[model samples]
Target: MKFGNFLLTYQPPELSQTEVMKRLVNLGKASEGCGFDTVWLLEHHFTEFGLLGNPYVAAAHLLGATETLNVGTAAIVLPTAHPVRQAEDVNLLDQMSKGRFRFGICRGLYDKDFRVFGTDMDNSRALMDCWYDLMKEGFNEGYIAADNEHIKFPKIQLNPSAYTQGGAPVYVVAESASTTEWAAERGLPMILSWIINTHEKKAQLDLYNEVATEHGYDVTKIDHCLSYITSVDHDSNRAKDICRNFLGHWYDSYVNATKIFDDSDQTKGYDDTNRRIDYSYEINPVGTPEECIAIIQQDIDATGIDNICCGFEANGSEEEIIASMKLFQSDVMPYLKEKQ
Candidate 1:
């Protein structure tokens, strides 16, 4: 599997702003040195949960740190901002990153975010449709008509057409089935979240692939990128303890953000709580190098997904993180490369 890291520069109550940004830049450098695929940033507002309210800015910092890795937003809240402005910002980042940019777009899910931005949640879908339309038009045709409620830019040209073809490659972050279908209709790839269970995740992927094929798009060109919570330790017991201590806090943050305070035990979606030091030996790699190899082999056989966005900031230390990454690179990734 192709391993990537979702660099969540989260600022809890205790950390200062400077400290947080420092950690983020430093971590990006570490990830580059560790041989990772891409580094992504998440966007949020009015919450200590996510320090990266401006992901393109963060992407710039990360890109500056890494010489040759893809950098982009885990998502930019499309409905909350004017489409032209958002497109320009992403285009600028693409240039700054020297073409190593992938712009991921999403409709903001948190109600509070929309409320604060004076955006009507009810109109988000329509706004997203128009936003995508305008962005694509600007990318391919240099300019597009703007007739939305909050947007009024004329058919002006957008300079520096992204770093790649059709501007920076746009990946829609879809959490629901409807959004998946929407992404397919737009002919955009997807960045799937670990919000649903594995069985449902697989079903959703199949549905997305089917829809893309039905639309006469190349299903193989579509990406099944997933964000997964992960931890790595020499001892299985140690890994479990680390997760147990951190999981509740992470769960609390999610519950508050999604306002699903009623539904506890969120692990029904994705859980890597306890495994024998050698357990991931065949199915879901953890533990030592030898064990991870077995687990990775099983993963290749099971899910053909190769692009994995590892949740490094949520749990675990830099030492453990680096070790797991090194292990994956040394033992598992080579075999996959050889096989491919």
Candidate 2:
């Protein structure tokens, strides 16, 4: 299976921004040393949850730190930003990365960001649709001229076009079933979020494959990427203990920050219900080296999912986090490399 690291670059509520960036830089180098293939960035503004709010800048810094690892955004919230500027920034990053950038697109769900940006929350889907279409047009045709009520432009140009022949690959992230089908119909490759349950994931995967087939494309030719909260260590009990303290904060932030999650099952006095449950590693590939390897194999066997990305920066000290990645590199990855 292919393995990559997804960086949330989590900053606990009290840490300084400088400290957070320091952690990210160290994590980037560690991920590179551990043989991770790619490092994906996430963008969230005005939240203690993630420090890399401007992911384009972060991507530039990260790409410079490593020789070959590809850098990408888990998403660029299209509807909330000026699409032309967004296009130009991503194009520049692609050029800067020497064509090793991948894009994950999303219509952001948070109401506050929308409020801050003065965009209509109700029209986000439409705005996202237009922005996605126009960005692709701008990337390929060197300009876009779309005349609409919400989005209007006589003409827009993105200079220094992305290096890829048809421009860089764009993968749309689907956090819900409806969006999954929407992305599928557009023939975009997908990045699945872990917010949904396993049964939901299976259903969406099947639907996505089916839709791709109906569109006269080889479903097997499409790329599928999945992200999960994961950790790998040699001591199973220690891994769980380390995760519990910070995992609650991660969950609470998501539950409070966005309306997408269902908080009905959340425990009392705790605001987040998304904590890694017991046996979660069975599906998530988290645990001791032996257990992680088994979990990875089980996912592959059960779902035909060969590409996996794990979020490593969510919760852990620099030492603890690096140790987990090292364990994966030394023990879990070798057998996979041999098999490949």
Candidate 3:
């Protein structure tokens, strides 16, 4: 089983950006110290839901600060960005980290980012399909060129090849059917959403497996990642109480800001993101060590996903987050590994 400290950067909505950054820096250190093999970053711009606008930049800093802790971009919003330059940035980070970097891109939701980045909100999906295809080829051949409607360029060589032969470990965030099919088409593994229900997650993975198998990928060896919002304490009651307060506040900000997640189960047409959020609130690796272990095991059994990425923030304080991570590694992890 693989474990990563899937760190979140929304540190207390009131904290200054500098303080938020410092808080994340501390968590990066604790990620390694707590026995996580990797630490992943979330990129957000023009919002408090996430503070690190450039996860590639944060990956560099975290990789430089820790010896063995791998760093990844849980995803960078690829729409309205320079794809070739993005490729170079990831390869450079991969080289500098000696292959410790994992690169990921996403179908962005924040209209603010779309507006600020000058991308048509409706065309974001098409842009990702185009640019990510070009970027993938760039990694494969160490040179890139495009002559499509969205992008037009001559072939150029990449100065810094990723430390990994083909490229750094690469993936994309997937939730919708189109995005999941898109990822499967490219044979890229997915970073499945934390907020999605177990049944939804199973369906998404099932679709990916179906498509990836059709695309000639070895479905048996795929390493799709799963997410869980985590909090742990010696006293089971105390742990739940802490998360209800801190994570609740954070969730309120996040769901409202995205505007995609309304606080309702009745949807006009789409299956609401709130159903997933509701599902998540009901199940997480929180509470005492024994309880945490059971929750994690249940998720593993339900999803058949061995790669677990646990987010520890939004749980009162940095102190609380670190202690949860430490306890998770010391208690929750070993039990599951042995079960496997």
Tens-digit per-residue lDDT, 1-340, candidate 2: 5677888767777667878788888887677788788888888877777756787888888887767888878887878888788888888888878887878888886766775666757777788888888887888889877788776778745788877766777888886667877778887877876554456666778888778778877766576776776667667776666566555677677666764345453222211144454434346656677777765565455456667788766446777677777777788778653112
RMSD to true structure for each model, in Å: 6.7, 5.8, 5.2
Question: Cα lDDT of all candidates, in order?
Answer: 0.68, 0.73, 0.78
Among these predictions, the greatest lDDT belongs to 3
lDDT of 1 by residue, 84-191 (tens): 787887788877777888788888778767755666567777788788888888886777677657466677878767666678888888877788888877668777
Clash pairs (backbone) in predicted model 2: none
Ranked candidates, highest TM-score first = 3, 2, 1
What's the TM-score of every candidate structure? 0.83, 0.88, 0.90
lDDT measured at residue 74 in model 1 versus the true structure, 0 to 100: 83
Model 2 misplaced stretches (Cα beyond 4 Å): 195-198, 258-282, 337-340
Question: Could you tell which candidate, 1 or 2, scores higher by lDDT?
Answer: 2
Ranking by lDDT: 3, 2, 1
Off by over 4 Å in 3: 255-279, 338-340
Clashes of each: 1, 0, 0
Candidate 3, residues 1-340, lDDT tens digits: the string is: 8888886688575688788788889888877778788898888876677878888888999899978899888988888689888999988998888999988778897766765566756778899998887887888788898886676889898868767888887778887889899889878877877777667787888898888989899876777887778878888788777777766677676766665344553332221244334335457776888887887777677767788888888564767677777787788877884223
Considering summed lDDT, which 10 consecutive residues are worst modelled in model 1?
Answer: 269-278
The parts of candidate 1 lying over 4 Å away from their true place are 12-14, 148-150, 258-303, 335-340
- lDDT of model 1 at residue 240? 52
